Symmetry: none
Subunit: 553 residues, 2 copies
Amino acid sequence: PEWTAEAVIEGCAPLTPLNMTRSIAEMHMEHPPLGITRFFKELGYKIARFVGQLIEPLRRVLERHHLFGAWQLTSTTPRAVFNIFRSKVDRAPVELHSHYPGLKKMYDILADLWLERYGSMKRLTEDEMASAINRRGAMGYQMDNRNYGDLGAYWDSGDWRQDVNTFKRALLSGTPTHAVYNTTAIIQYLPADARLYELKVLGGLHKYLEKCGWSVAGQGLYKYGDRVKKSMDATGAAISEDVAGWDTKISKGLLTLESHMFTKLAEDEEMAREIHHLYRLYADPHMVVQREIEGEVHDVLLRGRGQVSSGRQPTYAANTITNFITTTYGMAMTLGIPEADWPRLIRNLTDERGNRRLLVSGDDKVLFLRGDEARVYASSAYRTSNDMGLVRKDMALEQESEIIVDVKEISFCSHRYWPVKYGNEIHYMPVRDVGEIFAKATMATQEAWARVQGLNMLVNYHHIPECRMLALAILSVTRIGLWLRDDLAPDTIHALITEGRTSGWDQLGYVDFKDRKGILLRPDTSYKNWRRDLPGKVRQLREDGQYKDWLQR
Amino acid sequence: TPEWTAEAVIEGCAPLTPLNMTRSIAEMHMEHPPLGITRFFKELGYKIAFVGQLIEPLRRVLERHHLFGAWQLTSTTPRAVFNIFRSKVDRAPVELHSHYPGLKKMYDILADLWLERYGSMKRLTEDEMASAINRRGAMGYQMDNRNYGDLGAYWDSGDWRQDVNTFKRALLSGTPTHAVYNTTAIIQYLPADARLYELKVLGGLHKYLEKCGWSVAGQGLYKYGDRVKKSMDATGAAISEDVAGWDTKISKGLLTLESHMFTKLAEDEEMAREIHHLYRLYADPHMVVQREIEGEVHDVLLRGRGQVSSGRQPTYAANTITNFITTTYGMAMTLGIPEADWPRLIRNLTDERGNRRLLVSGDDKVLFLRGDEARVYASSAYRTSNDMGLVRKDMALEQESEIIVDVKEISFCSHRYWPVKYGNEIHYMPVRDVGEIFAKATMTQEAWARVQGLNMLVNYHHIPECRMLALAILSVTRIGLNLDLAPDTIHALITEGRTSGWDQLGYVDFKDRKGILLRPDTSYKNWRRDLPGKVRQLREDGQYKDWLQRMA
Ligand SMILES: [Se]
């Protein structure tokens, strides 16, 4: 119903709403709006086998002492879909605060460092686009009638070349086609022709992130732990605070600074107008979310103001940049760093020099500081993020930050990092609750998709014994011939970790036996019987194809 | 029509039987039948066709009183290349002699010692390769059509990854691709993909040598004199004898022992097959040399048997191993050391214990012995090396060896070594004819010159004219090229940081500044006089620093 006024950000082109009458009509609303949301404006509504068996003998201890989670409601009813929307998404971002000129100055600094060092940003190419799509992606309501199976099918047909140009021409006129977000359970995504356009236009942001020492873009999970140890060694204190529902809290004001920075990176004038028009869409999101009232399912069209959508490929790069800026800003403000040193500050963070480091990935971030500046930051830095509504999760509003002094306690990208011996080298490797690893590996071509999880798990989680054995069991049960290949050997793994200074199955280390507790499986009777029965269990599932014995390693 | 002698059949060793060279020979595009005017090689066919300006005031003195010549002022006509080759390379190695059983035992003893102590040998990693290749290296005729600029452009492209596997797979099949040597003026080399493969397979030999007390592998030249003094201090006499054209005299029989030894070092059986197949190539060398007859330039494909090519990355490591084994075998035989003590002898030479010491680098060797055993070695040890054709350069066949008793008379790696005082320490530093030093040092051009400036300052600061030129080079080249050095780095290399400053970097004595070193006469003083102005005259738009201030 009643929105606050927007912020007036000097020096920035405003994200004026586009003419959405064409895109709204493609959704085919029938009935007037009910209006039961507190921030979103309703405009109208219309009437609507391999990994699992391999881990089944471990399922009971995984449900009881770990986060396997058989408590998945499977089908999210339309009533539950709307309930999640109303509690998590239907909340007004904080638009009015006094930090935009400071934040803008830092967006400008980062943009200038990037142009100075690496030049202007280009649209993605077809091969760069081809390597980045989720071929399993959905088509969207506005394009189901064209009958493609998914994104990969619609990509292979080459029909996207004309839809993307059609989408681009409609967007640049001010009256876009296919501009209304679809939702699933809340994941928000535009139709597939819109997603290839925004991937082509903004996909280059990832390239800059590959050059920044405070980003992990284009690095394997196996590289993260040493980066955490490296940053911790140069500082000694870390602050890792998650924000509750980060996507839902980004303001239209911050999106304006995002658009302003990205247009500044555009190589030509037209590309800048494309980026700007994409953000006119983003800051004025229209989406269709299901409800259920009196046994009747509705598709509900709702209008919001400037949040961040789940299923846009640029979101990761965009969230990563904005999380870095806002964190460095609040940090610089709290520590009293003068504006004149802000260029050196961003430069140093990018180059990993000095005694302050950041690691940022999406809404996930770790701030590294010396002991004295950590205490200063911990006592008051929350005041600035609270002004912008970036409220920290599971903490009281004004609780002082927890200061981490043990590198094994630093959580980042949902993992902690422990030292694992590789020959005479030590490298920090990821650990999380093995229920979560196993849950992803089995839910989150079925024999084809299973063999990827086995290849994934062996490279990334070989130091967790149960993860190596499930990986070797997956590889023994999936058939041959369906960076990591059928010929995946330790030499491939040692090159990723130690650049080939180690070799052989013998030099792939494990975690200490004492720490195989808590998040990892305690080696108990259920574990021993799983291991004892594992070779017998790989033989009963094998069918038809040719196979190799892996558990012997 | 050259008629080779019989080969040698060495017991216990896999023979280096020739490879099917048909495919690799066909890659050279030969057009005409052989002329056949070589005495040893068999012709198969033929086909048709900054620093400089800084030292210029010393050009006259360097050309008359030192070994400078007129650098980069002449090139070699094709007739001259073939004369060079016909005189130096076209000579049969000595394959038939009685020393192969004794030599194999020591090859076996050394291989067993390394395995026991340091484990098996692995192929180099991609970082290990990258940090050892010669980026300006040539591509080879068989690879010019791929339009790479040099080896670095080839390496940075990542196209080498499959070519090396393609080379590997052709080699192991017995019919290699790209196995014929190219030549330049005589340096011989395979195409760039082959040199990456052979560096990958055999590049690990270097790691073994860095652990041997008789090797200077992976040590800077600034460490050599102290090694010479330390070996001299433990012995009292030295014999330093150069072999004329060492590469041209290694036999196929000796290559069979090298291959035999390195296959034993391999960490798995397919590595062993790769090494042996590479030596099936080395022992059966095909190369293309130029010649000129009646005004017509030829590319002549020639086939020989079992000598050593220089444009091969493992050649250094292989040569110093064989140099050590043949020298250790000759000394043991001549001194009457029984076979049962050969394991301890090799171990002791590796550990720098006992009263016999060796220093080996390529074909350069110095044998350190007590005065008594030095007399025995000098009077007959040449018999054994003459038997293997390793004839000593510039001496009669049976001239007794020169016995050296003054540590400063010892030549090793083209240098002699004089004591230079660093604070209260003495360290032996390399000296040679400064005409050679300046000649060796004479875009990428400015970057290259500045590296010669940093190298010369590190290695030759004790030579005054060398320090001054290096400081001049450091003042005339920009800051920030693609190569901050201070004396704190130099002392760290020489005295482990026990000394410090410019004022503790020693000089040679004034009296010894003659002969090989420049005499500080009128040409020298005028050169020093005009150097600051020539430095300013040669500067271009970069950011420079003055270095001449660090002397006078
Ligand atoms: Se395992």
